[PDB]
Design an enzyme around this catalytic site. Structure first.
Site, short mmCIF file in Angstrom:
data_model
loop_
_atom_site.label_atom_id
_atom_site.label_comp_id
_atom_site.label_asym_id
_atom_site.label_seq_id
_atom_site.Cartn_x
_atom_site.Cartn_y
_atom_site.Cartn_z
N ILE A 21 0.86 -1.19 0.00
CA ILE A 21 0.00 0.00 0.00
C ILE A 21 0.90 1.25 0.00
CG2 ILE A 21 -1.57 1.42 1.48
CD1 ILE A 21 -2.95 -1.22 2.24
N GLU A 23 4.71 3.30 2.20
CA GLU A 23 5.76 3.42 3.21
C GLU A 23 6.17 4.87 3.43
OE1 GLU A 23 9.81 1.69 2.45
OE2 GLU A 23 8.96 1.38 0.43
N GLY A 24 6.81 5.11 4.55
CA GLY A 24 7.28 6.43 4.93
C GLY A 24 8.00 6.37 6.25
N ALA A 25 7.84 7.43 7.07
CA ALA A 25 8.42 7.51 8.41
C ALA A 25 7.64 6.61 9.38
CB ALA A 25 8.41 8.96 8.90
N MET A 28 6.09 0.44 6.89
CA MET A 28 5.52 -0.08 5.64
C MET A 28 4.10 -0.62 5.90
SD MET A 28 6.91 -2.95 2.87
CE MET A 28 8.14 -1.88 2.29
N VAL A 29 3.14 -0.25 5.04
CA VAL A 29 1.76 -0.68 5.11
C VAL A 29 1.43 -1.62 3.96
CG1 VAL A 29 -0.70 0.02 5.28
CG2 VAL A 29 1.07 1.41 6.40
N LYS A 44 0.69 -2.68 9.45
CA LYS A 44 1.81 -1.75 9.45
C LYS A 44 2.99 -2.34 10.17
CE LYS A 44 1.74 2.06 12.03
NZ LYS A 44 1.23 3.39 12.46
N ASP A 139 0.19 15.88 13.09
CA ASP A 139 0.67 15.57 11.75
C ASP A 139 -0.44 15.28 10.78
OD1 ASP A 139 2.62 15.51 9.82
OD2 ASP A 139 3.03 13.37 10.07
F1 LIG Z 1 -5.25 3.39 -0.62
C1 LIG Z 1 -5.25 3.07 0.71
C2 LIG Z 1 -6.03 2.02 1.12
C3 LIG Z 1 -6.06 1.71 2.47
C4 LIG Z 1 -5.31 2.44 3.39
C5 LIG Z 1 -5.35 2.07 4.82
N1 LIG Z 1 -6.35 1.38 5.38
N2 LIG Z 1 -6.06 1.22 6.71
C6 LIG Z 1 -4.86 1.81 7.03
C7 LIG Z 1 -4.39 2.38 5.85
C8 LIG Z 1 -3.10 3.13 5.78
N3 LIG Z 1 -2.41 3.21 7.11
C9 LIG Z 1 -1.52 4.24 7.40
C10 LIG Z 1 -1.18 5.19 6.43
C11 LIG Z 1 -0.26 6.17 6.79
C12 LIG Z 1 0.29 6.18 8.05
C13 LIG Z 1 -0.10 5.19 8.94
N4 LIG Z 1 -0.99 4.22 8.64
C14 LIG Z 1 -2.67 2.11 8.05
C15 LIG Z 1 -4.15 1.85 8.34
C16 LIG Z 1 -4.53 3.50 2.92
C17 LIG Z 1 -4.50 3.82 1.57
#
Ligand SMILES: Fc1ccc(-c2[nH]nc3c2CN(c2ccccn2)CC3)cc1
Ligand code: NI
EC number: 2.7.11.24
Length: 338
Positions: A21, A23-25, A28-29, A44, A139
């Site tokens: 999906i 990544e960043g600080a 990774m998701v 995550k 943030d």
């Molecule tokens: F096109 C997408 C589809 C699903 C998600 C999603 N669904 N549930 C989550 C996230 C992302 N996510 C994050 C993103 C930035 C920082 C911390 N956590 C973790 C929890 C994000 C984008």
């Protein structure tokens, strides 16, 4: 264990069919299939143990999100880590999987005024809850605002979240007082970020896309005009204040000139959120009660926290080895045989 972008995601056997999906600080998701709930979830992966600051962020987010219970705030459903503290190098936070975020949506889609209004409402509804628990996000940005298939919005990424204390205190969504007045614990910093997000929803482009600190201030001043003497007669960084005083006069640009097609009530609320002086900036409840949000404002359906959030320990003073033990303890309840 599956490998996503060359890196190990040791979440099996329960979680499988991994898909990247972002990544960043934050780490990774990935999305994955949960063979118990028979749904896809977000996972995550965080590797924070080498740095005391990353340890603090991990623990704060876990404690805050496990306490919080609100429709516009993401929760934590499960946490995976190693069976022993010596083997624990990574922490996997399992959360509800959303359809997209506001960053991706704003890159491909033009929003109608009704959807800008609705999204702004949900952001503020969630923020009302966070602020009522005496916490600030710090943030807020479009990539931290998650949306499902039915336009329900959730705020995520509480790694930089802190218990508010206002009496004594990219970069695109950062309030001027963070860069100037050395403020980092005032709820007003979140309102500025929401103002930046509202402007972005109105035009599909960031309002203050600064390349660096000085450039960020020039972008703000390019719209708001030069700060008044009062705006500068506060606690401010000497270098920052001398820089501002060294600059030529800048005229204020009216909101209707930057967003000619926006609803005039949306610009009126935008004006109140994007105020230089944090003490003059609109607060969450007043922003919810603004005429722009009248169609959705429902104070009988806007929960607040039962009590202010408080940390039982001085997390900033703790060595990273101690924080690791607290993380190990906090995550014990998600392990078998608890
Ligand atoms: F096109 C997408 C589809 C699903 C998600 C999603 N669904 N549930 C989550 C996230 C992302 N996510 C994050 C993103 C930035 C920082 C911390 N956590 C973790 C929890 C994000 C984008
Ligand atoms: Ni003070």
């Amino acid at each position: 264990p599956e490998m996503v972008r060359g890196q190990v995601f040791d979440v099996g056997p329960r979680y499988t069919n991994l898909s990247y999906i972002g990544e960043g600080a934050y780490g990774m998701v990935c999305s994955a299939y949960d063979n118990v709930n028979k749904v896809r979830v977000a996972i995550k992966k965080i590797s924070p143990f080498e740095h005391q600051t990353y340890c603090q962020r991990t623990l704060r987010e876990i404690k805050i999100l496990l306490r919080f219970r609100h429709e516009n705030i993401i929760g934590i459903n499960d946490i995976i880590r190693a069976p022993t503290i010596e083997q624990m190098k990574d922490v996997y936070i399992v959360q509800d999987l959303m359809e997209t975020d506001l960053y991706k949506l704003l890159k491909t889609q033009h929003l109608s005024n009704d959807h800008i209004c609705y999204f702004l409402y949900q952001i503020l509804r969630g923020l009302k809850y966070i602020h009522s628990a005496n916490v600030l996000h710090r943030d807020l940005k479009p990539s931290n605002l998650l949306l499902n298939t039915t336009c329900d919005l959730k705020i995520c990424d509480f790694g930089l979240a802190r218990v508010a204390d206002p009496d004594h205190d990219t970069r695109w969504y950062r309030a001027p007082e963070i860069m100037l007045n050395s403020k980092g614990y005032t709820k007003s910093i979140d309102i500025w970020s929401v103002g930046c997000i509202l402007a972005e929803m109105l035009s599909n482009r960031p309002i203050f896309p600064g390349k660096h600190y000085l450039d960020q201030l020039n972008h703000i001043l390019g719209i708001l005009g030069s700060p008044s003497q009062e705006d500068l007669n506060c606690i401010i960084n000497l270098k920052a204040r001398n820089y501002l005083l060294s600059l030529p006069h800048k005229n204020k640009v009216p909101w209707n000139r930057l967003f000619p097609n926006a609803d005039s009530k949306a610009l009126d609320l935008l004006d109140k959120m994007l105020t230089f002086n944090p003490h003059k900036r609109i607060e969450v409840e007043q922003a919810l009660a603004h005429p722009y949000l009248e169609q959705y404002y429902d104070p009988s359906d806007e929960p607040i926290a039962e009590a202010p959030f408080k940390f039982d320990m001085e997390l900033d003073d703790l060595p990273k080895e101690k924080l690791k033990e607290l993380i190990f303890e906090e995550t014990a309840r998600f392990q078998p045989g608890y």
